[PDB]
Amino acid sequence: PPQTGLSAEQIAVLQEQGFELRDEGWEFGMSSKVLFGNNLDRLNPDSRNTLTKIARALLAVDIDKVRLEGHTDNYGDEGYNQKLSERRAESVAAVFREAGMPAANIEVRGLGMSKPVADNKTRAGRSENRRVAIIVPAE
Amino acid sequence: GLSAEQIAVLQEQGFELRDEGWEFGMSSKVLFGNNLDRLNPDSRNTLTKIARALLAVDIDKVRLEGHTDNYGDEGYNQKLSERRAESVAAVFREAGMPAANIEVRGLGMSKPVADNKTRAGRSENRRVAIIVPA
């Protein structure tokens, strides 16, 4: 399949919103520390507003299908981190639905600690791993 | 203490007078469902109504107390219970309750109302309580 499903107008929005093109599509990893702070799956209220802006920016150029993927670092129990990561992605999904993203077009996954982008030996690396990613397919 | 009009509202809302104040306990299953500390939307709406009923008669100070059963890790259950009480606090602040007048506590498994030896009792113990000091 050619990766020509997105127009330049759509790519431009993805770039401005912080997305980078990766193997599974355009991806923006959002810091869980920023999104949730000390909470479990409840979003900071300011972060809810931030997320709504991103959803609306995407919807304004007809990017109306996303995958939301939750991730953790390697601290704690693996099953718990998987559950936490799924619930965190689901919280983001709720905000995207409220902004108008069609519910049938949102796929939610929790990957727990299984797909790190950084080394878990460092606080910085662990924080980079604690994220919720938005993925927009390029197909 | 509380005025007659305030007591009448608390009684109407289903609060019961206990040693530490008027108390209204709510099921964590109903409040959070499968979530961790994110309230489900219907429960948010129900909590907002309670907050507004209280604020309409100048009940503007509460304690929110989160509880668990004794199943699972003690430390996690305590954090969970504190975070769940904080979620309810956030709803009350959004309704207009002064932030400085809200006390949030997570008791974990330490203060059961029912028998943890039974499933029924463990379920009753998984709750968040709204308390209005008398």
Residue numbers in the entry:
A (entry chain A): 30 to 168
B (entry chain B): 34 to 167
Which sentences did the original study use to describe this structure?
Crystal structures of the periplasmic domain of YfiB were determined for two different constructs: from residues 27–168 to 1.58 Å resolution, and from residues 59–168 to 1.39 Å resolution. Analytical ultracentrifugation data confirms that YfiB(27–168) predominantly forms a dimer in solution, while YfiB(59–168) is exclusively a monomer. The structure of YfiB(27–168) is an OmpA-like domain with a core domain consisting of helices α1–3 and a four-stranded anti-parallel β-sheet with topology β1-β4-β2-β3 (following the numbering for the core conserved domain of Pal28). The YfiB(27–168) structure reveals a weak asymmetric dimer whose interface buries approximately 421 Å2, or about 5.5% of the total surface area for each monomer, with a solvation free energy gain ΔG of −4.7 kcal mol−1 upon formation of the interface as calculated with PISA29. The predominantly hydrophobic dimer interface is formed by the N-terminal helix α1’ and strand β1’ of each monomer.
The effector protein YfiN (also known as TpbB or PA1120) is an integral inner membrane protein that functions as a diguanylate cyclase, consisting of a periplasmic PAS domain, a cytoplasmic HAMP domain and a catalytic GGDEF domain.
